[PDB]
Amino acid sequence: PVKPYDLTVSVTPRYVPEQSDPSQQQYVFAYTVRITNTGSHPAQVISRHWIITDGEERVQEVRGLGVVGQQPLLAPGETFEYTSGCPLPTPIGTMRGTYHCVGENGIPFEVPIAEFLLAMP
Template structure:
């Protein structure tokens, strides 16, 4: 938290993510587990920042890794003014009922500075699989 005496850092993006199991689209008998994840991206810096691309690392319960690279998120490259947030929902498919995701967003600030915004690991889990 900054106080009135402490200026905001110029480049600071906060990312929160939460996943949920999508039973209606999953077929456990075929090792097909679908998860939706809800992401909120908040510009906590003093510079406007635009999300250019994404890099996700999805690891299933067997240790199999899928990497996803792409432009923007859900077809958008949101520009966030200081204090603004952008939320979206997307999804992934795994062969196991438990896994993790993490990654980064590649950003460009209003002054042209490019930087990565880290996405901390979060759990993907079918209900009642973990205790």
């Protein structure tokens, strides 16, 4: 059952009309991420890798350190959640990526972020 090092991620995308203009191919989505330490030991999120694909198969990548300027050391059971934006020239698209993390024992590990869909309601 329980694992020593496990982090669970849930992402809920949503279109934002309030600041989008499909008339000129301006689509703005907002995805809210929920990282949850589901393992038996503390673990820290280090870096993030993102792959956003267009409605026309146009790939774009983002790489950086930490999530919203931090690399939280999550105790087993706690959560960390933020919401960031994703612009697209098409009304639909996908997003998939990776969070690079590390257990308290220092050994790094990867927690994949399942590819999800993005489209107007």
